[PDB]
C-alpha cells in the first residue's frame, strides 16, 4: 500500500512535466530559469565582487553562500517540478 502510494506520487512528475505551465506567452520554465539564473548570478557576482575594489572592509558573504542558495533551491525545485527537461533544453 505504501509503494502504491509511492507510485501515485511518482505518476505526477512526468504528468506535470507534460503540461506547459505558462505565466507572463512565456512559459513558467523560462521565467523560472531567468529568475534562478539571476539569483545564481548574484551569487557569482558576490563571489566575483572585487575585494580590493571594495572601499569598506571585505565582507565574507557566507550568508549569501547559504540563504541565496536555499532560495535558489526552492526556485529550482519549482522549476524542475512544473516543467520537463526537454523544453528546459
Amino acid at each position: 500500500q505504501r509503494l502504491q502510494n509511492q507510485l501515485r506520487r511518482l505518476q505526477d512528475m512526468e504528468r506535470k512535466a507534460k503540461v506547459d505551465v505558462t505565466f507572463g506567452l512565456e512559459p513558467v520554465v523560462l521565467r523560472d530559469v531567468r529568475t534562478a539564473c539571476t539569483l545564481r548570478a548574484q551569487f557569482l557576482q558576490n563571489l566575483l565582487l572585487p575585494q580590493a575594489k571594495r572601499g569598506s572592509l571585505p565582507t565574507p558573504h557566507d550568508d549569501h553562500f547559504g540563504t541565496s542558495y536555499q532560495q535558489w533551491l526552492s526556485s529550482v525545485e519549482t522549476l524542475l517540478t512544473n516543467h520537463p527537461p526537454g523544453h528546459v533544453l
Binding site: 507510485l7 511518482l10 505518476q11 512526468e14 512535466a17 507534460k18 527537461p85 526537454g86 528546459v88 533544453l89
Partner: protein, 50 residues
C-alpha cells in the same frame, strides 16, 4: 482448502496488481532514448545535450 484457494486467488490478484504497477513504472525508467520531443520528456539523462 476451498477458502484457502479463494484467498490465494485474492493474493494472486494482488500480485498481478503489483506486477501491473511495476510494468506501469518501467516505461519511465526504460525511457533512455529521448532523441525526440514526441516521447514524454521524462529524464534529462535520456536526452543528448549536444
Amino acid at each position: 482448502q476451498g477458502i484457502l484457494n479463494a484467498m490465494i486467488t485474492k493474493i494472486s490478484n494482488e500480485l498481478q496488481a503489483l506486477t501491473d504497477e511495476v510494468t506501469q513504472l518501467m516505461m519511465f525508467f526504460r525511457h533512455s532514448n529521448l532523441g525526440q520531443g514526441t516521447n514524454p520528456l521524462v529524464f534529462l539523462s535520456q536526452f543528448s545535450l549536444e
